[PDB]
Amino acid sequence: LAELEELLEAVHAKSIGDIDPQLDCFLSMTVSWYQSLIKVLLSRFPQSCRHFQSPDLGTQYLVVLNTDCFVLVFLDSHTSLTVVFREPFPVLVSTYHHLESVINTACFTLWTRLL
């Protein structure tokens, strides 16, 4: 977790809402919804998902690696949805494809709670 936090300080991250306004509703999702989405992402892509949690489980970080670009989901029980890139954001299709899979996973989790 410490290495991920240190690496995140030297990387460029953009929130999901910045790329597409329609995803901004995901920023208002509850902590339980965020945990359910993290569990769904871990179940769907265990090989590409990395989970880091604090000893008291207050802060949980879920990263879905693609490898220079990844989607990071951070939740503080005691939430954020941003895409982390090692270099500055380009002014590309693989990054959009990675976001589409995460968007579908978030959409799938939201639909489950409605039934």
Add this chain to the structure above:
Amino acid sequence: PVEQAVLETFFSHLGIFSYDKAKDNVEKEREANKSAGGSWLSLLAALAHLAAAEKVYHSLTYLIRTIYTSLHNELKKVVTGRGALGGTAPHVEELLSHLSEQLCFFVQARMEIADFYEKMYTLSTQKFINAEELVGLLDAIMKKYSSRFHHPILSPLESSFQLEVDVLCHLLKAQAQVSEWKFLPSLVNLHSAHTKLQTWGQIFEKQRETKKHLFGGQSQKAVQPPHLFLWLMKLKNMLLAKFSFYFHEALSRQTTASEMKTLTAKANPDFFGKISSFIRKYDAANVSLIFDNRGSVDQYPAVVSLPSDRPVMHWPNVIMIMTDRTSDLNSLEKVVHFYDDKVQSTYFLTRPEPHFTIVIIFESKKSERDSHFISFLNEVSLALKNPKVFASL
């Protein structure tokens, strides 16, 4: 001040749907303060009238304009009645005037909401309901009434209003989103409506708990939710069932068949289960709900297919039936029956939506006078359009 505390208590009672308690408290305060200023008595009378009007609106028995107009006139008279002969403090008088203005704005908003509800009840009898126009009108009304009663004294009333009105909006867009075959925004709107309904139910349960505490350990009747809340919950359930029926394939692709069937059985009505039962009983070859993608064979793909994938062989026959019987399908009430001797197939087509078509195809010669299939198609169309919920609202 005592007047501010009384107003806060009345507003808190109103926000918990305790109109009778708020009216009784206002009447008691007015009776005990007969020697106070005339503005205070006018405000108390206006508050009692507004509580009665709110109770009537919650009961939804007006489906109200005269009562709202009288309340607005009383509030305007109280605001403009700057009578210093009552001995009230000038700060108290200014607070009363601001409260009267906020109450007049709230009364106008309530009158607009009642007019919208009456329009929806009138349009319930229409074969097709334009959800986009209703959503736009609701958004315009909300924007006009936005931040009009943001006073902290009116805090629980306004929170009780928007959380309901937005809920209605959360339904309206959903009614459009289901019509446009949009799954993600329909699901988001349904989740928002469910959250708003749960928020309203929290206040209802708080009021019920307060009533139970006041009534002791006796087996008192539970505080029933108002007719508006029940209608909103029924509309949300109907919209969720319609979305599940339309988006059955997407939900079922992520789970097993048994789990998908169990999930669909909870939705009221369960269109998928009824369709499967009808297919099993009548030995129907295929039942396909196809959404028209024109303007958004591939132009009319089968969104839902039972009990298997959509027969490709019957695709051009269904396309020809839809094209030739376009005028009949446009009525959204008639059912078109076709027979093909080359394939010896019987096709029954209905159009519950202008962009959705339900087709039942059987590999046998079926007479057009078979009332069972026509009745089933009519019931399915009525469930999909959902005019009964709006009629009962």
